[PDB]
């Protein structure tokens, strides 16, 4: 069973350095050159370059000349990718991928952000004025992820929890919306249940008409 196992997700402040690990397994490491591929959030695959795993020589794509370095520890059958002086544009998933065949690491996600760990503020998106919309603004937290549920799970139909976005501050933000029948406002109680395991915080917010 051949596999590449990369190191875990990385959360880094601008300016810092990150060294990503790719551990190979199940074949003669030195016989196969290793490739590095970058994928920015939502974008295509970008070949960054290649390293000779016997002699150590690196070859870099023209866009990754400077700030990027491939290296080895052949004793341990490991390839390293180092990024110096991290920018916003280095936020991406980084893959190692071996020459010949179908082998790829699972990818290392790199987030660049000024933020430290912080749990969300949750604000009501209150219903308007025969179906109404309502929801919860989950703002100013870090890192990913948060889970949102509605009425402790009792309400799943009509729910949209959007993908998070990075604000300029480096803090994440999303909204959870639900469409419900107008007639139920003032009868039915709507609570959104936000959980953020990194900050170890849990928040419920009732959402009612203003």
């Amino acid at each position: 069973q051949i596999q590449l196992v990369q190191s875990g997700p990385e959360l880094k402040k601008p300016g810092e350095t990150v060294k990503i690990s790719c551990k190979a397994s199940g074949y003669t490491f030195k016989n196969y050159g290793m490739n590095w591929v970058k994928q920015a959030p939502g974008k295509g695959l970008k070949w960054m370059g290649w390293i000779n795993t016997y002699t150590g020589q690196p070859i870099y794509a023209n866009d990754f000349k400077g700030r990027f370095a491939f290296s080895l520890e052949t004793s341990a059958s490991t390839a390293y990718l180092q990024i110096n002086n991290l920018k916003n544009e280095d936020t991406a998933t980084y893959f190692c991928a071996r020459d010949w065949g179908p082998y790829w690491g699972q990818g290392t996600l790199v987030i660049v952000s000024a933020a430290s760990t912080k749990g969300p503020s949750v604000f009501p998106l209150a219903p308007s004025s025969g179906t109404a919309a309502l929801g919860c603004l989950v703002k100013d937290y870090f890192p990913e992820p948060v889970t949102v549920s509605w009425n402790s799970g009792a309400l799943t139909s009509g729910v949209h929890t959007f993908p998070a976005v990075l604000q300029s501050s480096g803090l994440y933000s999303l909204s959870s919306v639900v469409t419900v029948p107008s007639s139920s406002l003032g009868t039915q109680t709507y609570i959104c249940n936000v959980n953020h395991k990194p900050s170890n915080t849990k928040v419920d917010k009732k959402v009612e008409p203003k």
Partner: protein, 218 residues
């Protein structure tokens, strides 16, 4: 550098349709001495590593379903799905590896459905939020198709720019639609400088643009 032009970049399909993705090399990837094309096809699903479907342009990777085949030679390559299934909804990439690596732009495969106008809702900031000095105004675009939609923010008729972020759901697995949030970020002092907050929505399915609005305080 061998350049790789993949097309189309997006494809909307039904159960059982035949699907064709075309790759174009700027230089031949046929190595003359061994008559092999140094070309591969990958399927990649959200949050997953790319998965090798075909290499040497036409050899299928063991485990890939039979309905995938690659063909062509030299500069022109095609990936065919004889009969597409929901299992195959993914993004596909070509790869030349004769002279370094070059991936195509990628081809996204979605489920086609009838056009659907979005349901638009606008959400003012909460009083709780205003206490911290920032005001978030939220515009919801609910259950529409296709993905393309223009959201315009208007504060007191003044077109906003640079101060909003959008977010799109993935194509819904039950009714094949998308949803979009747009969030305008203002300071409490700017937010109270103005009265009429409007969200203006353009979409294939609306006869004309749709505005949802509210008056601060009312």
């Amino acid at each position: 550098n061998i350049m790789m032009t993949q097309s189309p970049s997006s494809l909307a399909v039904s159960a059982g349709e035949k699907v064709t993705v075309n790759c174009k090399s700027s230089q031949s990837v046929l190595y003359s001495s061994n008559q092999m094309n140094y070309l591969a096809w990958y399927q990649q699903k959200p949050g997953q590593s790319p998965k090798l479907l075909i290499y040497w342009a036409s050899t299928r990777e063991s485990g890939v379903p039979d309905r995938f085949t690659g063909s062509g030679s030299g500069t022109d390559f095609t990936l065919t799905i004889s009969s597409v299934q929901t299992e195959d909804l993914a993004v596909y990439y070509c790869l030349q590896y004769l002279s370094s690596w070059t991936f195509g732009g990628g081809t996204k495969l979605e489920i086609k459905r009838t056009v659907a106008a979005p349901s638009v809702f606008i959400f003012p900031p909460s009083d709780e939020q205003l206490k911290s000095g920032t005001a978030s105004v939220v515009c919801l675009l609910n259950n529409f198709y296709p993905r393309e939609a223009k959201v315009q923010w208007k504060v007191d008729n003044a077109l906003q720019s640079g101060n909003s972020q959008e977010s799109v759901t993935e194509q819904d697995s039950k009714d094949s639609t998308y949803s979009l949030s747009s969030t305008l970020t203002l300071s409490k002092a700017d937010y109270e400088k103005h009265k009429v907050y409007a969200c203006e929505v353009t979409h294939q399915g609306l006869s004309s643009p749709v505005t949802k609005s509210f008056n601060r305080g009312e």
